[PDB]
Design a protein around this ligand. Structure first.
Ligand SMILES: O=C(O)CCC(=O)C(=O)O
Ligand SMILES: O=C(O)CCC(=O)C(=O)O
Ligand SMILES: [Fe+2]
Length: 260
């Protein structure tokens, strides 16, 4: 079993800043899992972040650190072998978050997101640098429900300032892109019972510093509390040790690095 990208695939990712759809799970399997996960999300008894109104809580950040199925999701070979083909075999999953969309939600115009924390503007991800430090993170956006044009799917732009495709996904399919890739989104114009649920997991090679400058902090903002936070070594080895790391989830799920 190997899901590394071909030189071709890797090439078009380099060209577009994204690649998708890529199958992670069969639609029925994804749905089966999401049926469990959806209910488990409700129990926060072991969630690493406390009750708050910050987006870390409201958008359920890093539940892969306490929900078994999410813990397994970020470890999946279908995800890891692919991301590894892009930024290396020594991979860290430093975050996961949910992206729901409901009837009436508006779309967004063309833009690119930054990895700075909203509450403080502090950079969350810092790459090694000679002066400006790169701050991007490969994001794996998995459709837990279908992502359609009708329910507000994302929009990606081919090629890379200058030199409108809808990324529709079936449950279990994912789109992989740099967190700062140019994108937009359509408004949700479907029925009120048709919600879209995307689960995003973000990865950075081991040499990247996650949550820099927080050595003596816990309360970080936006509901994020680093006390029980740790990045997960998804594959390879960590020759750095400069990041908070979680070898095990709050429920005892052991994260055994995959040797692509
Ligand atoms: O969900 C949406 O409607 C837009 C999402 C978006 O623009 C983003 O995640 O960068
Ligand atoms: O994950 C990202 O790309 C940005 C995250 C962010 O801005 C935040 O958590 O406040
Ligand atoms: Fe966006």
């Amino acid at each position: 079993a190997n899901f590394t990208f071909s030189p071709e695939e890797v090439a078009r990712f380099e060209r577009d800043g994204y690649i998708g759809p890529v199958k992670i799970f069969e639609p029925e399997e994804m749905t089966r899992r999401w049926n469990i996960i959806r209910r488990q999300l409700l129990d926060r008894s072991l969630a690493i972040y406390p009750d708050s109104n910050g987006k870390a809580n409201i958008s359920n950040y890093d539940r892969h650190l306490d929900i078994d199925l999410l813990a397994e999701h970020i470890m999946r070979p279908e995800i890891v072998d692919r991301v590894g083909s892009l930024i290396g075999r020594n991979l860290l999953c430093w975050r996961s978050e949910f992206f729901p969309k409901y009837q009436g939600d508006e779309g967004t115009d063309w833009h690119q997101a930054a990895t700075f924390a909203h509450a403080t503007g502090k950079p969350q991800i810092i790459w090694p640098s000679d002066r400006p430090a790169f701050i991007g993170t490969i994001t794996v956006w998995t459709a837990f429900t279908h992502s359609t044009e009708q329910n507000g799917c994302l929009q990606l732009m081919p090629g890379t300032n200058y030199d409108a495709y809808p990324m529709v996904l079936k449950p279990g399919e994912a789109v992989i892109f740099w967190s700062n890739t140019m994108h937009a989104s359509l408004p949700h114009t479907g029925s009120k019972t048709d919600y879209r649920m995307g689960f995003a997991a973000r990865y950075v090679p081991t040499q990247v510093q996650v949550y820099p400058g927080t050595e003596n902090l816990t309360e970080y903002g936006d509901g994020i509390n680093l006390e029980k936070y740790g990045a997960v070594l998804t594959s390879g080895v960590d020759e750095y040790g400069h990041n908070r790391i979680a070898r095990t989830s709050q429920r005892g799920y052991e994260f055994v690095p995959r040797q692509i």
